[PDB]
Amino acid sequence: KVLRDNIQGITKPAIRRLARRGGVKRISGLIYEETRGVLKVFLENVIRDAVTYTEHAKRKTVTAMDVVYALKRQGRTLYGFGG
Amino acid sequence: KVLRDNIQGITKPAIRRLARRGGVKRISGLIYEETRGVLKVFLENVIRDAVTYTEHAKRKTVTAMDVVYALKRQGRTLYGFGG
Amino acid sequence: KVLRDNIQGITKPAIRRLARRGGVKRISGLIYEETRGVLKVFLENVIRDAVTYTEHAKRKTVTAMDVVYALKRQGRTLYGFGG
Amino acid sequence: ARAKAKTRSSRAGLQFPVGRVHRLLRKGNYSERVGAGAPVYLAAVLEYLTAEILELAGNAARDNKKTRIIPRHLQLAIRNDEELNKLLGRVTIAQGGVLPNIQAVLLPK
Amino acid sequence: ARAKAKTRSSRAGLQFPVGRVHRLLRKGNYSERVGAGAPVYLAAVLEYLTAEILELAGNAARDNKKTRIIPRHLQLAIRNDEELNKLLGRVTIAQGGVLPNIQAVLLPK
Amino acid sequence: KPHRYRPGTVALREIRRYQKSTELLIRKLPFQRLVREIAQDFKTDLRFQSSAVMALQEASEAYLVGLFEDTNLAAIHAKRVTIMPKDIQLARRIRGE
Amino acid sequence: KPHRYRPGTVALREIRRYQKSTELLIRKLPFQRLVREIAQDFKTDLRFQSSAVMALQEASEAYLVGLFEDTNLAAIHAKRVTIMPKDIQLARRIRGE
Amino acid sequence: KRSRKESYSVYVYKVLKQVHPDTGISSKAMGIMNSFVNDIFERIAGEASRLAHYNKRSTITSREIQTAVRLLLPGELAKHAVSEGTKAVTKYTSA
Amino acid sequence: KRSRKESYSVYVYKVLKQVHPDTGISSKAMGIMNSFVNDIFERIAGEASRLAHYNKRSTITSREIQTAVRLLLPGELAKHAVSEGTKAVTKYTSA
Amino acid sequence: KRSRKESYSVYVYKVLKQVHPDTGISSKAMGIMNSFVNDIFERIAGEASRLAHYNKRSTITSREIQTAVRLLLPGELAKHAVSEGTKAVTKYTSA
DNA sequence: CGGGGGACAGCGCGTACGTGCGTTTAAGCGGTGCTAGAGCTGTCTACGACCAATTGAGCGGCCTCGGCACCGGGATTCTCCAG
DNA sequence: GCTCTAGCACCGCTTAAACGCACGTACGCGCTGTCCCCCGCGTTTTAACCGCCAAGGGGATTACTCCCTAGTCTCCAGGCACG
């Protein structure tokens, strides 16, 4: 039921694919755990907000509408699921 | 289906005969490519006018009538096919 | 009445004192030109905004209230002038 | 004996509604009263922006010899344009990816 | 007892006169029938032409810092554009002079 | 001898392929497991719309490609091409957090 | 020989003195006249109270100085103590202009 | 007593103020614009008449000038003009 | 049937039929356009509200949005937007 | 005859004397406090307005501005503000 | 596993502001008159907001075919290799 | 439309700012060695993806009924203007 380690579920070659989308040619070996950490920290930054809207809505299920609202609160407005 | 080079079908010796009609006695190699180029430019203008006629005629086959019409508009009126 | 080139009125030692508040030890001689340029860019943006505010208000004198409104818009909110 | 219901958007000669835009201004709670020029003006600027970006989207699609617009074409269309980029710097397009913007020294010689 | 007068230019949102061009096509004697969209189409075309050239002429007048348009501004405006050059190659402009056109060999050194 | 491409050539081919590509670069179900895990850190037994998982996915990868674009600029700033943790720390400190 | 410090010691004293300092770093009159220069560049016959000139002043040192903390973080990233313009426009680009 | 001579006065003035409110007019430039609009009008009108003769239609519709403006007007100028006229005629049919 | 989820659907298709008759629309691109119109409308409406509070105005007409377009949209797009918005409000006054 | 200007003058002075009875205050610091109160009040009001927009609530409630405190105010000051606000509304409704 | 690419420090080498100190001048500091317009007050009218009705375009749902997703083979290009 | 007040305009001293030159020292960085570390590719594993099926939590909707909240009349009292 409870999950303990899925930050390693975002695999190192998947991070390599992301960095190729970011245009990175050479990636250091210490990069990948740090990317896991910063994506992790960004997920607290997003999801505390998203859970905060969700508990304002007296709901239990996370919706993409609140995801859009949380991302646009931080000035990283996401097109493609609003409306 | 589609064709990618028939500009060269108006060949180098064919361009040589055409300039032999004009009286040109010596022709360097650099002339021929620009002659096919300006051939493409002129015939492109004429066929633009012609297909604009033809689409305005609501037909799908070009006749010589709209050809001599377009040659009239461009200013190189052709005798022999009017009417 | 009209002026041409008062942008050097923000003198080079003023920029040096600014970078000393910014904690820059060594300031190259190349630096002062783009500091004046970016200062021109930022003030051009801010005064464009402020002039738009004042011209909306049908006045001819810029208030500091409109200045701090322009700083609210562009994301450099300033405290202490009646905002 | 009432007059025929003719649309305010065609009174603007435009397509984005005066009606919907005026309704979301009134119910978006931005002012107590809203002038009549407000929704027509704002619908006009949205129609200008929409026409411009779908022009660039159509040209991007025909450049990739494809017929139907895709968010790849949209994202390409946005960051060819400097003032659109300055407008939409902090906005991320769904499924758009990144336009090829490759820095020179990491390219091979 | 009568409908209020609305010009066709206001119906199309143009400010060139639709009725004037319709009259001048009737009495220019080009066909015995003219479709209704033809003169407003032509007036819109000339609207785009005149708007384009008055953008160019006003910009040129600002570039020589003069407030009023002059045929010199017009002649710079036409001759600094390629497609207007093809459109008006055989056109004489009164007091417009000639575009500043010096050949490379005419320069010293 | 089996043919072997030089180091960096396949990297540039991956760059060109993935800039041309538009699809997702993360396996979707381990991502969903991770976001359910971190949601459980803040509120127990939350449920996720699959579209909400996709939205968190695309926002997250957009955030990551923005940060990596910043760190590429930081790496070419530092006369280097191998990106380092100091580049990521620099990019985050410049961006204001 | 007369009294003279090594390079940087007077610079450190300058840095310490003007981080401690709260008074204004730039001159008043050329700043006001430059504001007027930009003003009549946009609309003629535009006037300013002294408080508005102070406000644009405060905004100028805030913006410029903030660019200098961003800039010398870039400079220490590049292992250098001397800053160069590329630090400034790269910092402006990372900020998201 | 004088007879009125028709021109394109107020239309060129209004379109200039719509594109440049702060730019003035000289009268010789105004004559140049009068001659421009007359010249381009007669070009399009004569080409339209020739098309009506040519396809043996007794009428000139919007489609005839659509044809004629890819005939005379070039390219992007022509396609912008086609778009302007298309939105103009949709507004006209809507009114 | 379900409740209507309001959108900008038919408007984006008709403006595309004005600007490009032959190309098609995907649902993802249409969602992008919906979120774009939502974002730009939200920005302009919020800044109009800001100017309403700032000049102690309970009234928001086209002049404040002209102010806001001059604020937000940079330069070329700003003056373009002012041009067709002024044409739109003039045809609104002429009905 | 001059007009009254609304400020936070004696209120901030009172809470200053509550937290530090023996200290003084400058007018420049008072401008800083007045703009600070205005800015934080505006941030909370804007996020509360957006939250009411998102969940279709036509009223501003203490629950959703508490939500806004969790949003804008970070970390430990957030739960201190929650304690302060819940205590305040407790002794308010008991009053 | 293998390997080539990258990173980075020592040495050196040319370099460029930092800083000490005299000068200028014009900003800084104190002083005076006027009016532009900033701001406050009275009028009112343009103007916008709300409600019954009514309709008409806009949206939910379904179905179709063909542009596009999926599939397969040779060329061209990139690159690398060997000549 | 009025008015009144601080900005605009003009005036007169005062060395601080600026500035410029000159000595001096540190600064960046390229070559090149040197060391090292991660990409490319091959191989192996394994659960991701697919695709297929059961089940129920709650999202969303409709209704009900009651909690609440702006508005207004009015009254008074503490914050702002003023000193």
Residue numbers in the entry:
A (entry chain P), B (entry chain F), C (entry chain L): 20 to 102
D (entry chain M), E (entry chain G): 10 to 118
F (entry chain O), G (entry chain K): 37 to 133
H (entry chain H), I (entry chain N), J (entry chain R): 30 to 124
Quote the study's own text.
Here, we report cryo-EM structures of human H1-containing tetranucleosome arrays with four physiologically relevant NRLs. The structures show a zig-zag arrangement of nucleosomes, with nucleosomes 1 and 3 forming a stack. H1 binding to stacked nucleosomes depends on the NRL, whereas H1 always binds to the non-stacked nucleosomes 2 and 4. H1 contacts DNA with L1, the amino-terminal part of α2 together with L3, and α3 to stabilize the nucleosome and contribute to chromatin compaction.
The observed stacking does not allow for interactions between the H4 N-terminal tail of one nucleosome with the acidic patch of a stacked nucleosome and thus leaves the H4 tail free to engage in other interactions. Whereas the inter-nucleosome interactions appear to be very similar, we note a slight relative tilting of the stacking nucleosomes that positions their dyad axes almost parallel, in contrast to type I interactions in which the dyads are slightly tilted toward each other. H1 is absent from the stacked nucleosomes of the 4×177 array, but is present on nucleosome 1 in the 4×187 and 4×197 arrays, and is present on both stacked nucleosomes in the 4×207 array.
